[PDB]
Design a protein around this nucleic acid. Structure first.
Ligand SMILES: Nc1ncnc2c1ncn2[C@@H]1O[C@H](COP(=O)(O)CP(=O)(O)OP(=O)(O)O)[C@@H](O)[C@H]1O
Ligand SMILES: [Mg+2]
Lengths: 990, 202, 200
DNA sequence: ATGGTGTAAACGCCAGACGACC
RNA sequence: GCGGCGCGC
DNA sequence: GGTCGTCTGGCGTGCGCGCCGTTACACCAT
């Protein structure tokens, strides 16, 4: 129950905090209680046994065994492990050891199984093995002599020991990377990092430094008072133990008072001018105490030195001046040479988590007293609290908040304070990350990271990942590690220009915001007398409009300031970005503020740290990428694109030399800043003696046509539609969303004759973009309401008319030309139906949908009704969109795995692949081989067989089970088409 | 002049000078509370009412009338019933379900609890502005009102008299609010004391 | 199938089978009106209020109690009191003042008319769906109701059973149906006829 | 320079519940 | 979690 | 006890990140 959960959490925490000798006076007193002795022998006796087995002891485990015997429960072969572990570090007379061995042999217990069942530490296991071998040296077992190797058909060539392979290395020596690792370790032992802001400060004054000085002495006084209050409350809470129970103070005694006062003074500076939720503050305090405890326990246990030694050994595989006896994958090399062990920490339940946050919140406000009003007179000289409780309305509910004092806010606003704060995990790593070897082992040095992103709860994905054998996940773990081992650096000229525009009034058309000083002003003021009855209403209506614009401007400038300050911090450095995945297999980076899945400015400040010479064919790909990023032409072959770049050489030179002075040609492109970076790179490459010897750092992008559709045409082979999405070879690229538009608009050229308002107001507004998303989603689940909601927003930004009824558009494609859409795309809808009917019949029997990807990753859907019943509509509308989004990720991971074997730098956005200018063709061949490898196996038959085995096994009733059987056994017939034609298509991922 | 803003009905001062008992009512979105006084600052009744069926998405007058009748059954007889009035208005686009809940509770307690109004036309239920009560006790900062739990904690642990019959009950109520504070229970005593000190006992 | 959506409160069928009189009340922004019947479809009283000091500015319980008590003191005594229920939505950002007025007056009427509720717990005031009566009279266009002056013009000026003494007064009252749009408040008699036709 | 303070009334559809079924 | 916004595939 | 055919209501193509504010605004005459 709740109290059992509280005691289990308390004991499991305090054995980790080295406070078990302090907490030994709780279970004894609670067992002395008669009525409260229930829920005490369940799962906490082995916890204190393991904690006693962690460190040395002298006749301390006799009490545990006596209490277990008095309770009359089964020791379950875990107390004996603790006894063997504590038998070391002490002289043993071998007294009645034969009796102990007989007791081990009797009572149905056997050896060679508790070493993994008890799951002690490596030191404890070694001590137990030594104590066993000191008496009986015959018993000894090896864990595993050969490492497991995958045997699947799609992953047979990667793990094969034959053939010659080339593996890339880093560009930095060993000592430099050792110092970088030391810098990141010292940066991450501190939980926060301070960054100077970007805004321009002017005119300090005497009252400014007076406010700074009174802030300093106030903070010193608060620190002393907070330390005294912590000491007094700890002394008060220590007294209640011997005549009470459930001491909450050991969790407080975990952290030193300096850490507590630091986090409490640094959390007050970020508290807003208005109040905050009291429960949210309690949650934040408990979460931050947990996060600090993790790093403190990791650094006090000696794990840091072992990790440093292993990292220094492992770094020779990446170093530029070191050699290895045999090359291998990073995961296999970390698996060899030894490995550390994951903590596998379990979070404590809510009653012990929120109560201590409440306690710290009550501690902070009571013991912080500002010297009365902070005005210029000092006549009062009284002590009043800085914070007060205020009962308020927020959302649609009454909520109590914790509000500051107006004098404190006025004091804080008077200073400049160009310092910004950041969490450590929000910034990129300054050292290469850890490899992915398990769902538990991660990428950061000290902070644990989850492999599957979940919004809230959703423990079924983790259970499915842990249930499958470990060899299945190797092909995804290797891809995640390879994407994590890419080194980056910051472009400088672009950052300087961006800061120059940022300091002086901004430029909102380039994506950089504008300051609140240039917010719009009302055209007319307000008059008290009612000069006109209509004047007052319009005055209210147009003076209630500017505030929303000002608030939006404030939000945009805040986020841009954060991003630019973090970018400015990482100048003249090299950094790294790890990766994770969601529940359908797609991959994302961990640091949110600054990565490559962002806007144009976030992508134009990133460059490859290691450079490659252009080679014979490196400059042409740069010009093709420049034309691609311009976005002027997306329908022509590569020759016609590279021809265009030679005509704008003067514009490239003028934009590279004087950006903001001369002709601003790089403005007006779809991606201006990326275009400017590419122009600078190309101009530097051109003005050289030998262009083919120039070292370049700019990534080149290759994207796929329509990846969701492209998988449909091979799950069942279609000679129609494959040509539509370029799966089959052709000279000029073929567009689905462009060809749909011509039929969709054919009627309006010849129907405004009957006469309609919506038809003749448009006049050429229709394009590829306006219908792109709706035409994309028709293959997936879509309704007319979502189509209208999509089309309305696209009509909003276009400014020609505010008569926004978008129904002509939603019906015209999903309905009037929908048959034209069936005629345009047909036979892909049979699976779209078959899978939806199968999902419907599974859901009516009360079951969620689960399956396995062709690589081996198991995938499940979490939609449940408000244990709980399956939501039928949400699990039949989401299955087709969530089935293709696993296969595309499988294709990406196979392409990455076979691209790494030839020595290439590979980083991937969904559907778009990035590489050096000299390494494009190899990736283009690997992608078109791996698509055929992936889609030549029968996918729908295996899916049908897994569905039948998982669902149609039970003969509970004849009718529903039989109907499920004949729906799952019925499969659409694949068409006559061969998959050996992908290898010669030029625009498949181009 | 000040009594125009303090109390909303306009009542002649002679009948205020001879009042005997007063009950103060504070509404909430999840509870109601009330207290009783007997001109010697002697507290006799002070209770709350939790576990409602209202404010859960249904606004039907049948359950309102059943719940109000159950609450009004235990309320004893008195010369006046003073009521708490807030500063919410119709102008807020949100916070309208809260306002709709408050006006229904006020109107039904105003239509009930005034038994003889149809005969002689004497009012017996009246409002009191909450900002004025906070300013009397100096609980106002930043154009807002603070909690007031520390004031009533000092009283319970010459301003107000206190018998021994309900002292342990309210100290248990103080301990319950230490775990989870509620201000509907605390605003009742402050409003009653402010009434005996402004309108009566000049 | 109907009585679960006709009447908002729940009551036994036998009590609805045995009735003797109903008072039907319909309110609005400017005034109210009511009518009386006597179990054989025979009118006895049919009145309306002139004007108010309400709904002009602020909302106060004192003026509401004054006006409601002053109006109710003229009511006759009957068996069941039935009042309309308009289905406005909380979700609509507009129509808040009229909704607040309607809910306040519904609560006041339920409070003050349901006499002897504390002793005997039987409900005496009921809420009827307006769209249901609109469908029964079939004047609904599917989204709104039309004017109901046609039925009262056809019935007045063999089953109507108008008493002979009240003909001249009712005719004099109806002769002033050319201003203030008071004829829309004549749906009280229609709702009473509908109740007698769906309760027996 | 400052608080004081007032016065502001836009539509389909399919799948779970409900009065009638047995 | 509610509301207003903005970005990526 | 078990149905239960039908009739009324509530979401509406799938996944992932960031910022802000809880109506103040405006008037006031000292
Ligand atoms: N709005 C949306 N709704 C549903 N799925 C979407 C989506 N946008 C993207 N996707 C998914 O992501 C895939 C990628 O679509 P895109 O690669 O952007 C086609 P595109 O031709 O590259 O668009 P573009 O021409 O504007 O770049 C789709 O096939 C689909 O699976
Ligand atoms: Mg694409």
């Amino acid at each position: 129950s709740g109290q059992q959960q509280r005691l289990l959490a308390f004991f499991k925490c305090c054995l980790l905090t080295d406070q078990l000798p302090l907490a030994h006076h709780l279970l004894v007193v609670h067992h002395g209680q008669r009525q409260k002795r229930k829920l005490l022998t369940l799962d906490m006796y082995n916890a204190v046994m393991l904690g006693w087995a962690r460190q040395g002891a002298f006749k301390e485990l006799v009490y545990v065994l006596f209490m277990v015997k008095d309770a009359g429960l089964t020791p379950d072969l875990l107390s004996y492990a603790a006894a063997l572990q504590c038998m070391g570090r002490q002289d043993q007379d071998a007294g009645t050891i034969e009796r102990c061995l007989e007791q081990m042999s009797q009572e149905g217990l056997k050896l060679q199984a508790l070493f993994t069942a008890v799951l002690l530490s490596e030191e404890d296991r070694a001590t137990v093995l030594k104590a066993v071998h000191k008496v009986k040296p015959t018993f000894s077992l090896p864990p595993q002599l050969p490492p497991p190797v995958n045997t699947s058909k799609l992953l047979r060539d990667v793990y094969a020991k034959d053939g010659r392979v080339s593996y890339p290395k880093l560009h930095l020596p060993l000592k430099t990377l050792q110092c970088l690792f030391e810098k990141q370790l010292h940066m991450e032992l501190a939980s926060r990092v301070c960054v100077v802001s970007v805004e321009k400060p002017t005119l300090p004054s005497k009252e400014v430094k007076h406010a700074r000085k009174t802030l300093k002495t106030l903070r010193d006084q608060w620190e002393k008072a907070l330390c005294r209050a912590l000491r007094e409350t700890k002394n008060r809470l220590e007294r209640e133990v011997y005549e009470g129970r459930f001491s909450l103070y050991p969790f407080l005694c975990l952290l030193d008072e300096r850490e507590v006062v630091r986090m409490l003074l640094q959390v007050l500076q970020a508290l807003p001018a208005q109040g905050e939720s009291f429960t949210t503050l309690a949650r934040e305090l408990s979460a931050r105490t947990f996060s600090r405890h993790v790093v403190q326990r990791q650094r006090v246990s000696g794990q840091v030195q072992a990790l440093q030694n292993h990292y220094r050994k492992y770094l020779c595989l990446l170093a530029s001046d070191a050699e290895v006896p045999e090359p291998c994958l990073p995961r296999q090399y970390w698996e060899a040479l030894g490995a550390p062990e994951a903590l596998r920490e379990q979070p404590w339940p809510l009653p012990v988590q929120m109560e201590l946050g409440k306690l710290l919140a009550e501690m902070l406000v009571q013991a912080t007293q500002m010297p009365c009003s902070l005005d210029k007179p000092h006549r009062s000289s009284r002590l009043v609290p800085v914070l007060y409780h205020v009962y308020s309305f927020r959302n649609v509910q009454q909520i109590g908040i914790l509000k500051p004092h107006p004098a404190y806010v006025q004091l804080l606003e008077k200073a400049a304070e160009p310092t910004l704060t950041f969490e450590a995990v929000d910034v990129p790593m300054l050292c290469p990350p850890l490899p992915w070897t398990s769902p538990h082992s991660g990428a950061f040095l000290l902070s644990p990271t989850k492999l599957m992103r979940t919004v809230e709860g959703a423990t079924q994905h983790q259970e499915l990942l842990e249930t499958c054998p470990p060899t299945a996940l190797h092909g995804a773990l290797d891809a995640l590690t390879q994407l994590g081992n890419c080194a980056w650096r910051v472009n400088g000229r672009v950052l300087d220009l961006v800061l120059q525009l940022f300091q002086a009034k901004g430029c909102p058309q380039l994506g950089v915001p504008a300051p609140p000083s240039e917010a719009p002003q009302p055209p007319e003021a307000h008059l008290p007398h009612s000069a006109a009855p209509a004047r007052k209403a319009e005055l209210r209506r147009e003076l209630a409009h500017c505030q929303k614009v000002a608030r939006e401007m404030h939000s945009l400038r805040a986020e841009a300031l954060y991003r630019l300050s973090l970018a400015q911090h990482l100048r003249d450095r090299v950094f790294w970005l790890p990766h994770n995945m969601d529940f359908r297999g797609r991959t994302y980076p961990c640091p949110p503020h600054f990565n490559h899945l962002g806007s144009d400015v976030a992508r134009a400040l990133l460059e490859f740290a290691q450079g490659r010479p252009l080679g014979p064919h490196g400059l042409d790909w740069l010009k093709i990428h420049l034309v691609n990023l311009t976005g002027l032409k997306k329908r022509e072959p590569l020759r016609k694109r590279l021809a265009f770049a030679e005509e704008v050489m003067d514009d490239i030179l003028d934009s590279a030399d004087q950006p903001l002075t001369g002709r601003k040609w790089w403005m007006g492109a779809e991606e201006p800043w990326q275009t400017l970076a590419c122009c600078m790179e190309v101009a530097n490459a051109v003005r050289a003696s030998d262009p083919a010897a120039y070292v370049s750092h700019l990534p080149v992008h290759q994207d796929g046509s329509c990846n969701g559709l492209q998988h449909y045409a091979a799950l069942g082979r279609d000679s129609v539609g494959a040509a539509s999405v370029n799966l089959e070879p052709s000279d000029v690229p073929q567009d689905v969303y462009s060809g749909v538009a011509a039929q969709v608009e054919v009627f309006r050229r010849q129907d405004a004759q009957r006469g309609m308002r919506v038809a003749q107001v448009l006049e050429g507004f229709i394009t590829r973009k306006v219908v792109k998303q709706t035409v994309m989603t028709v293959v997936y689940g879509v309704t007319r309401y979502g189509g209208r909601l999509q089309i309305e927003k696209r009509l909003r930004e276009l400014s020609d008319f505010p008569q926004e009824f978008v129904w002509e558009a939603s019906h015209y494609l999903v309905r009037q030309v929908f048959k034209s859409l069936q005629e345009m795309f047909s036979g892909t809808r049979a699976i779209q139906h078959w899978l939806t009917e199968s999902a419907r019949l599974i859901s009516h029997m009360g079951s969620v949908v689960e399956w396995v990807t062709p690589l081996g990753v198991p995938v499940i859907q979490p939609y449940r009704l408000d244990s709980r019943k399956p939501n039928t509509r949400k699990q039949k509308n989401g299955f087709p969109p969530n089935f293709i989004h696993s296969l595309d990720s499988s294709h990406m991971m196979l392409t990455a795995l076979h691209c790494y074997r030839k020595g290439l730098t590979f980083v991937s956005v969904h559907d778009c692949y990035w590489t050096h200018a000299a390494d494009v063709s190899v990736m283009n061949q690997v992608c078109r081989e791996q698509f055929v490898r992936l889609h030549s196996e029968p996918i729908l038959q295996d899916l049908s067989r897994f569905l039948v085995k998982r669902f149609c096994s039970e003969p509970q009733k004849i009718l529903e089970a039989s109907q499920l059987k004949e729906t799952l056994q019925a499969v659409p017939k694949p068409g006559a088409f061969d998959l050996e034609q992908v290898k010669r298509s030029t625009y498949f991922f181009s | 002049r000040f009594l125009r803003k303090l109390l909303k009905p306009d009542i002649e001062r002679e009948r205020l000078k001879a009042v005997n008992s007063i009950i103060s009512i504070v509404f909430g979105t999840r509870r109601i509370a009330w207290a009783h006084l007997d001109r010697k600052l002697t507290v006799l009744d002070w209770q709350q009412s939790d576990r409602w069926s209202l404010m859960r998405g249904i606004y039907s007058s049948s359950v309102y009338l059943e719940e109000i009748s159950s609450i009004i059954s235990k309320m004893p007889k008195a010369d006046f019933y003073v009521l708490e009035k807030t500063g919410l208005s119709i102008q807020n686009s949100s916070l309208f379900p809260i306002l709709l809940h408050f006006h229904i509770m006020e109107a039904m307690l105003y239509a009930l609890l005034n038994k003889t109004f149809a005969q002689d036309g004497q009012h017996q239920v009246l409002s009191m502005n909450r900002n004025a009560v906070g300013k009397h006790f100096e609980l106002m900062i930043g154009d807002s009102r603070t909690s007031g739990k520390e004031l009533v904690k000092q009283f319970l642990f010459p301003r107000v008299f206190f018998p021994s019959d309900k002292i342990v009950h309210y100290r248990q109520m103080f301990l319950s609010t230490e775990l989870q504070r509620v201000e509907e229970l605390y605003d009742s005593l402050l409003q009653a004391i402010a009434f005996y000190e402004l309108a009566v006992f000049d």
